[PDB]
Amino acid sequence: PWKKIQQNTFTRWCNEHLKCVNKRIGNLQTDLSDGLRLIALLEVLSQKRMYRKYHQRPTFRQMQLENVSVALEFLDRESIKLVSIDSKAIVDGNLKLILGLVWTLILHYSISMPVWEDEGKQTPKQRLLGWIQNKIPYLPITNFNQNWQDGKALGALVDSCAPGLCPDWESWDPQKPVDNAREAMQQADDWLGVPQVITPEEIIHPDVDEHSVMTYLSQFPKAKLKPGAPLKPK
Template structure:
């Protein structure tokens, strides 16, 4: 510890108690000449194994040789420094290394493990560069990571375990003993140093994350700037009021400020949560709360057409469709509500597919016969001609139809004589009856 020779000789092979006592006396005399104050301890107490006094002596040696005597980097040797206690001196050195953390003790301020990571990274920038993003609730993981890096690459042995240093009842002397090794630590060659990341220094700005002003179906854009945060990946997630989460489109701009252009298209109105992550950690102010309003499009410029809107011709349990065209109507949402013959609006569901080019395919399948009413809305208002009224017929089943009459007899008909027969369609559903008659030389027209 002292790097000095003893003042007088001692027995190198003490086999008798008297030799052991004499050797301890030589050591205690040396400590006294080093101006180390020893109270209530003698050679007999040490040889007899008085644990309390021995531990006190060890702590005295740690204070003197590991904390009081060495001159540390960034420490000035002046009268004020000499008057500080060893505890004040070590704490002052740590505070100088960690100006961003309020470290004032050797117990509770170390329980989250973040201060350990900060100290390791301060002594060797790049060993624990992401310590400030560590979760304080994961104190054990934090302490293990920091102490592992200190052990492997700074040569600081774990004289205290991670479990002990995060314990609220940890012994301060043990923590001081461990931390007193840091001022003299030197980084070993080949250490896996990483660039320092500071996600909280990334910032986002633009209309897409403003509390108001964004509307449904309209692209919401904003920018993420990462020049002060380091090198990392930007990810953006948007969660709508129903809890559906989608990843936004992020494009690097490759400029000097390392900015990223981001956009998303909200599908529903209401409060959205926009989460912006840099290197897997929230940036400053993330997540952002964005209230999306209904788009204010012009419903009068919207048109619709297709077989599903025809007054007749649609049958029950058969899928039909129509198209809605919104070109020139501005931003807005297409909505379709179908009322069945009893006026209920929840029995027939309509699937709306965006076909691009301001065209939407609306598909539905009526399950009942009778009059249906179709309401088509854009941006909350009915479009021209809406609501549409259609009559749904029964499903067509030609197999139950049958025909009979003299006009279908194989024999007995004469030229120029009227040939009659009847077609019975009861139970066959809705459909159009067509009759084709082919004679020996031409197709004849049937008169219904």
């Protein structure tokens, strides 16, 4: 069951981007095969259009391979190195490899490229880990799994971005993981506008993979306080 968390998160992350161009993925293992959603997703992330024309209604496997080819040449031109990916992998629904592709895109567009203020030559994992640490310097943040399990750090992070959103996170009962996670995230979703690409039940699970957590947490650096945010002190 928990072995679907990365798939779930990666799927939500894609939909969050695909909605603006009115598209959505139902099944990650099969909905990027005709290459149309993959192309759409790339156009949104890079804000650039494809180098050549593609088939807007690929019924045949050939047209799908050609379609993914457009998406893959696009990545090749942007100098975005992919891991063990060919068109055949996407079109045939090789789950493990398309997930690798999504993480590659997530890593590139969400952590490597973006401009981040709040001051936070280093691996992407280090950059995000550095930004987060700077936000809550009173918690030893060294990883993207165990540090978030009790759900208190999530409250600490949200309140750090907008002091007053979760002011008494420190007094939160550590043995109520989901309630802490939900509270923190729902507030981040509401007033910091970060989508819950990973759910509170998943973020605290013992098996949660660092990638899923990084995908969700990679959304805080560019987050901004909304107007009318209910803030309460001590």
